[PDB]
Design a protein around this motif. Sequence first.
Motif, PDB file in Angstrom:
ATOM      1  N   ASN A  35     -31.231  28.897  -2.090  1.00 45.92           N
ATOM      2  CA  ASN A  35     -30.329  29.657  -1.223  1.00 45.92           C
ATOM      3  C   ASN A  35     -28.990  29.881  -1.922  1.00 45.92           C
ATOM      4  N   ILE A  70     -25.273  30.214  -3.196  1.00 42.04           N
ATOM      5  CA  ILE A  70     -23.942  29.691  -2.904  1.00 42.04           C
ATOM      6  C   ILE A  70     -22.941  30.378  -3.827  1.00 42.04           C
ATOM      7  N   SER A  71     -21.790  30.764  -3.277  1.00 46.63           N
ATOM      8  CA  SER A  71     -20.773  31.490  -4.025  1.00 46.63           C
ATOM      9  C   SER A  71     -19.807  30.539  -4.734  1.00 46.63           C
ATOM     10  N   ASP A  72     -19.132  31.079  -5.748  1.00 46.80           N
ATOM     11  CA  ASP A  72     -18.240  30.325  -6.620  1.00 46.80           C
ATOM     12  C   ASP A  72     -16.825  30.273  -6.046  1.00 46.80           C
ATOM     13  N   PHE A  73     -15.908  29.662  -6.808  1.00 45.31           N
ATOM     14  CA  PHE A  73     -14.498  29.630  -6.475  1.00 45.31           C
ATOM     15  C   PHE A  73     -13.865  30.947  -6.934  1.00 45.31           C
ATOM     16  N   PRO A  74     -12.841  31.526  -6.257  1.00 47.10           N
ATOM     17  CA  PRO A  74     -12.350  32.882  -6.617  1.00 47.10           C
ATOM     18  C   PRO A  74     -11.224  33.011  -7.653  1.00 47.10           C
ATOM     19  N   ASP A  75     -10.319  32.036  -7.782  1.00 50.14           N
ATOM     20  CA  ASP A  75      -9.140  31.971  -8.692  1.00 50.14           C
ATOM     21  C   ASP A  75      -8.096  31.028  -8.104  1.00 50.14           C
TER      22      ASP A  75
END
Lengths: 25, 355
Positions: free
Chosen positions: A18, A20-25
């Motif tokens: 499933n 999952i998204s990463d950290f943006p900055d």
Amino acid sequence: DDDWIPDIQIDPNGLSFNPISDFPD
Amino acid sequence: CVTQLLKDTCFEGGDITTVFTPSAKYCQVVCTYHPRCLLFTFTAESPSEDPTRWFTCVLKDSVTETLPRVNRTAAISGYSFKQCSHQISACNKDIYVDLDMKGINYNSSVAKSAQECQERCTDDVHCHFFTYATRQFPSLEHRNICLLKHTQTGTPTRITKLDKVVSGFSLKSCALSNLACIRDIFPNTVFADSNIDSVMAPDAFVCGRICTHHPGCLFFTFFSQEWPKESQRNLCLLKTSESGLPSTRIKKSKALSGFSLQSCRHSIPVFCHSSFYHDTDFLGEELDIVAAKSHEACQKLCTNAVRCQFFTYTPAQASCNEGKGKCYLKLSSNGSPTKILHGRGGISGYTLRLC
Ligand SMILES: *[C@@H]1O[C@H](CO)[C@@H](O)[C@H](O)[C@H]1NC(C)=O
Ligand SMILES: *[C@H]1O[C@H](CO)[C@@H](O)[C@H](O)[C@H]1NC(C)=O
């Protein structure tokens, strides 16, 4: 012992998951 | 042998594949354990290079076992430890600060510290590396989050620099645990879950030792030499699943399945397979045809030839022939034979390079 058909088709690829998204900055 | 890295040095055209490692020393470790890597050129972070080109770790191979050295800014190059008598541990207990190591994020929980994230990655069957957000991270949504990650190769796909976040590696390789690697053995059984790779193995216990060292294998199925379909004989099917367990056990004879003990007794015993396989020809890509007296000499020829992965000594036997026989030095991509042949009068074996 009564019948053997080759019905296991070796298939190399990966395990799904499933997303999952990463950290943006 | 060379263990010290070559500063501002770039090797030229041996590209096998390119993977991303935190440092050049880890790039070396990845090279060392790669079946074919002899050389590497790592690209450290510098303003002379575009951020996308950072942490590029290029695995290289050369027929001449070396490559042209050109000088280049922020490039660390080096040689594998395949020949060396000193050993390494392949255990990256280091935690890397302001580093996002990217892969397939499969878990997203909370943890008190990076060490709690680490212990999660270590104890999770699928985890290769982790990234943990310190409490001081801009997004309150993300503060103190633990992302468990895995990749096909076991190494990150892309590493970027992200402030207030720490990445690290699973410490399964750091365990000791002299215990049986194959753990659960399922005789006269085939498994049937995602096949992620396949190698040719002489016996079922090589099959298991490969799965234990393979980044993404948790259970396996070995078809024997007496298995019906010839194409499938000595076929070592490495498999995985989302649960970590097999789904269904299909009782078929002349096939043996089993369970990796991922952190068992396996830094380098799959590499110390000093067994000799008689009436067995390990097929591969031919590297040389030298002549020698024994298979024990053939082995020493394969160990000393850094590009040699396995060998077949075809014994001459002085029945009516000369005493000296032929020592086929061989190689493949996976480090294993492309086909095991039984009954053609050869004594086969594995390189002792990393033993
Ligand atoms: C670096 O450049 C070349 C390799 O490309 C090398 O032969 C030379 O010795 C080095 N130059 C200097 C002045 O360091
Ligand atoms: C991580 O969290 C996910 C989502 O709840 C859960 O399915 C999984 O069991 C957890 N794994 C670990 C080791 O924390």
